[PDB]
Prior knowledge:
Assembly: monomeric
Order of helices and strands: HEEEEEEEEEEEHHH
Name: 3-hydroxyanthranilate 3,4-dioxygenase
PDB class: oxidoreductase
CATH architecture: Sandwich
Strand order of the largest sheet: 1-2-9-4-7
Radius of gyration: 17 Å
Bound molecules: chloride ion, fe (ii) ion
Distance between the termini: 48 Å
Entry title: Understanding Extradiol Dioxygenase Mechanism in NAD+ Biosynthesis by Viewing Catalytic Intermediates - ligand-free structure
Keywords: bi-cupin iron-binding, dioxygenase, Oxidoreductase
Strand content: 35-45%
CATH topology: Jelly Rolls
Number of helices: 4
Helix content: 10-25%
Amino acid sequence: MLTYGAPFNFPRWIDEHAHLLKPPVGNRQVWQDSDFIVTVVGGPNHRTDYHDDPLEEFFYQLRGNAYLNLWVDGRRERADLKEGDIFLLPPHVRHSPQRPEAGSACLVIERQRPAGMLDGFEWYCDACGHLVHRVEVQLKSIVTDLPPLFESFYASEDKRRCPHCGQVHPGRAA
Ligand SMILES: [Cl-]
Ligand SMILES: [Fe+2]
Ligand SMILES: [Fe+2]
């Protein structure tokens, strides 16, 4: 049977879920309990964490513009997701998506992770660039698994303290 229902109009779905595609929620998963995790991500949202995804991530910036802060070949880089852009991120490339525009919408597609395949979330020192803190998580449900992780980082000057230069990371904002 059609476990995930019939086809439906995507722009209309996005318009209908617009109140969820802005703070405080910011994103909405299209289908539940599927192998492909299909999400629409709105804005505005800025963040300081880098994601280490053990699988690929596909992006299609449908409305508005956004960008990814990246670590590529040991250097800080930026990949712009201009409206209309698509992009495929290889596994383990550290990325911190920034979504400055209200009313923006990006299709993001990921895969469910098998047991034992973990995701990393990392923060880096603004002063010297050294890794400050890394948490590894078996990512089953983004909504329950992720906010407390970020919250525990922000609340702890110990976790935010750079092991190299001693500078305390600013936490939630930079
Ligand atoms: Cl994103
Ligand atoms: Fe990611
Ligand atoms: Fe540092």
